[PDB]
RNA sequence: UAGCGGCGAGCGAACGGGGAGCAGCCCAGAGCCUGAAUCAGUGUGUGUGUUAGUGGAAGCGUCUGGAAAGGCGCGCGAUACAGGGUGACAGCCCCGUACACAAAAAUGCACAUGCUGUGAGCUCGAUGAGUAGGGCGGGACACGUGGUAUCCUGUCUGAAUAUGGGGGGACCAUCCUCCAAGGCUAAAUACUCCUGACUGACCGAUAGUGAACCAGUACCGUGAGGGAAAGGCGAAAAGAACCCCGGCGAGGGGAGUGAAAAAGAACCUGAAACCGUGUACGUACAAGCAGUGGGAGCACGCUUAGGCGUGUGACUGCGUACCUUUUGUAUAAUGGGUCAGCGACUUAUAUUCUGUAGCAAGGUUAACCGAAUAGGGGAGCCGAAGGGAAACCGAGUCUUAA
């Protein structure tokens with residue numbers, strides 16, 4: 006019972022080379038090179054799913070820090086005053102009100118100042 | 123129990139051990155698989171690196187040519203070289219214990235009764251070796267795919283069934299596990315129902 | 324039941340190991356042989372009883388005894404075998420005809436193993452003390 | 468084909484009732500004068516093969 | 532064919548004995 | 549297994565049992581009586597096989613289609629539904645098949661018969677000498693010189709003749725068994741250059757023979773010798789009349805054939821590497837395993853009272869390939885130019901453990917026989933009892949005087 010590998014091998018190779026669309030040079034044409042590229046693309050995508058959470062929070066902190074100092078208080082004192090006032094809005098939403106509703110954000114700074122003072 | 127007949131609406135008395143025991147699926151599987159392994163002929167072979175035609179000359183010198191090491195053109199890595207683990211002719215037959223073979227027949231036989239795929243008569247023959255006679259007889263009984271087991275095989279019935287591919291006719295000594303499971307119905311003459319039970323002890 | 328409705332008993336058909344067929348299989352790239360060495364080579368491995376060059380066990384220890392040619396032509400008979408002869412008389416010839424001892428046996432002994440519930444006549448055999456009491460308890464007799 | 472017994476092992480081990488092997492003790496062939504009688508007296512009876520050595524013996528004597 | 536002439540020459544090959 | 553063995557690696561019987569097949573004779577010599585068995589050769593007859601052959605059943609309507617053997621409807625043959633072909637898949641179109649027949653001539657068997665050579669039976673007698681054995685050296689016996697029986701002989705010797713000789717594993721005695729030194733003999737057994745039929749959980753063009761093809765060829769070597777690559781138009785050549793550009797070219801464009809010509813002979817299908825043409829986006833102030841997470845703009849589609857899909861990706865955070873070998877590799881250690889195809893834990897037979905099925909103090913047969921995966925065959929093997937070096941003893945036994 007001789008088995009020929011032609012039809013199965015071609016389909017396994019075609020699966021990898023479809024994931025390599027858009028890569029430069031041999032990385033989208035040549036299996037030995039496209040295989041290593043699709044593996045490293047999955048290594049990066051796993052690693053960068055953790056980092057997407059770190060990079061967005063770091064961005065929200067910078068936009069809260071900027072809008073708070075426009076109201077006369079720093080970030081580290083603004084967040085502390087929200088804890089003493091028992092306000093529990095996360096930084097994702099605070100960075101959203103800072104940009105889109107600056108009159109609500111002022112009301113948050115006054116509440117933080119009243120509790121901190 | 124007693125199998126009801128179809129010639130006289132009489133009954134035939136049969137052993138409970140032979141026609142009434144439970145179905146032992148794991149034992150009958152080992153017996154129909156062993157049957158099929160014994161029908162294999164197993165004739166094939168390939169050539170190792172020893173038997174491929176060629177010379178024993180080393181293709182190029184061991185060192186200095188810049189090519190991978192080679193020692194033979196018959197190497198199984200090379201095109202047109204030997205097969206690594208080439209086949210030989212082999213015997214694929216297995217052993218069945220006598221008691222496991224007889225036990226599977228009783229499990230098979232009692233399942234046919236339980237699924238009313240077994241039909242008992244004492245009258246089954248034809249007057250001339252004509253295929254159209256047997257085919258008309260089977261039409262009356264509402265049988266199309268059927269195994270007919272007879273006490274002693276008649277020449278008229280053997281010759282009348284050769285050209286019908288859905289019909290096989292056998293003597294009581296020539297039943298086998300695989301044929302009882304293959305055909306849709308089994309017809310036994312009440313003298314074959316006799317002889318099978320002494321054979322099955 | 325049809326030819327495509329029969330299945331084997333669960334746990335009867337373990338699949339065999341297939342070495343060198345990938346990472347995911349657990350036996351790839353080396354086939355469970357570990358890294359280099361004599362034992363990892365094709366056809367490698369040391370012979371039976373090799374200990375590294377240290378004088379092996381079956382050459383460290385002395386030989387003892389001899390083999391007796393008389394022991395091969397001697398048999399034991401159990402008490403449960405006495406009911407299996409024909410005619411109620413037990414001798415060498417009747418034990419060979421019952422397929423109890425081999426055709427080349429010349430001496431036999433009846434030992435206390437099993438039990439006897441019928442009167443037999445043991446003839447020409449050696450009988451242990453325990454079996455002599457057991458044969459006579461059932462109504463038999465022993466001669467020589 | 469049939470496995471072949473290591474014929475020099477069969478001259479040195481005998482199998483016992485529960486599957487162990489018995490053997491003769493070493494050190495009782497010569498310079499015996501200088502040995503103590505207490506030492507020699509304990510080397511006379513046959514011994515049993517230890518647990519670390521059973522694997523080697525069983526492979527050598529497949530028909531024992 | 533044979534080896535390159537500089538790969539056979541002792542002077543070129545044997546520079547670090 | 550018993551044994552042999554630097555008692556190592558290893559080598560490895562016989563006796564006895566079950567089967568297949570079965571067959572016994574002649575010379576070393578005279579007489580009586582003859583040709584009486586048997587075999588060999590030839591001739592003829594009879595039967596039978598081989599080498600060419602003969603006959604061999606039974607289907608049309610309609611739908612799709614280039615074409616019907618296919619779908620659907622209604623029939624018939626079958627001792628024939630093995631197989632192959634036919635414009636797609638045919639029991640009934642063809643060749644066949646089951647079955648039934650056939651030989652002027654040559655030949656293989658088996659008988660019978662004729663002739664030729666052969667001599668059958670009885671009585672009495674004889675009973676294989678440089679031989680058996682020995683010394684020395686080697687070889688074969690499972691047996692390596694060992695305590696080594698038996699066989700063979702290069703060399704030197706050397707008997708007794710049924711009132712006698714050989715063997716029975718050193719050797720001797722008793723007993724048992726058989727007659728060397730002359731010869732012939734069927735079957736069961738081994739094999740396949742070659743012929744025929746059939747079969748395959750064998751291959752299907754880098755496989756299977758080295759060779760599906762004008763292959764042991766081309767080609768290579770002084771020579772012995774080594775040794776390739778290369779299959780497929782179509783159902784049918786209907787293999788492209790004629791016209792046009794061109795060199796009275798190559799090549800192409802039409803026309804025509806065809807179901808199809810992007811089936812056009814470099815011809816079924818026609819993948820990937822590799823090379824191009826067209827369109828959308830990006831790209832000429834910008835530094836690195838070339839991705840990944842975020843992300844504007846643009847282009848094309850969608851669908852609505854919107855932002856979704858596809859392509860591209862300015863800018864930006866993080867980010868030094870893979871295999872191998874190593875304490876440890878981005879390593880400036882190994883390996884790989886890339887693609888497509890092939891390429892490495894198998895097979896047989898012993899043995900132990902695990903799972904599972906059967907039967908269970910029992911389980912199971914091997915060769916072989918068999919109208920043959922059935923049934924028979926229990927020869928054997930393993931288990932139910934051990935201890936001892938062994939005789940021996942035995943639910944005990946060895947140790948020891950205990």
Ligand SMILES: N[C@@H](Cc1c[nH]c2ccccc12)C(=O)O
Pocket residue numbers: 535536537539540
């Ligand atoms: N260098 C010279 C001579 C030469 C021939 N073969 C050689 C081999 C090794 C050294 C030198 C040579 C050449 O190439 O013609």
Ligand SMILES: [Mg+2]
Pocket residue numbers: 202203204
């Ligand atoms: Mg090949």
Ligand SMILES: [Mg+2]
Pocket residue numbers: none
């Ligand atoms: Mg059988």
Ligand SMILES: [Mg+2]
Pocket residue numbers: 349
């Ligand atoms: Mg692992």
Ligand SMILES: [Mg+2]
Pocket residue numbers: 359
């Ligand atoms: Mg390695």
Ligand SMILES: [Mg+2]
Pocket residue numbers: 358359
């Ligand atoms: Mg190492």
Ligand SMILES: [Mg+2]
Pocket residue numbers: 356357358359360362363
């Ligand atoms: Mg190792």
Ligand SMILES: [Mg+2]
Pocket residue numbers: none
């Ligand atoms: Mg004809």
Ligand SMILES: [Mg+2]
Pocket residue numbers: none
């Ligand atoms: Mg002698």
Ligand SMILES: [Mg+2]
Pocket residue numbers: 716
């Ligand atoms: Mg003797």
Ligand SMILES: [Mg+2]
Pocket residue numbers: none
């Ligand atoms: Mg092809």
Ligand SMILES: [Mg+2]
Pocket residue numbers: none
């Ligand atoms: Mg080929």
Ligand SMILES: [Mg+2]
Pocket residue numbers: 818
């Ligand atoms: Mg083509």
Ligand SMILES: [Mg+2]
Pocket residue numbers: none
């Ligand atoms: Mg720019």
Ligand SMILES: [Mg+2]
Pocket residue numbers: none
């Ligand atoms: Mg390591």
Ligand SMILES: [Mg+2]
Pocket residue numbers: none
């Ligand atoms: Mg190092």
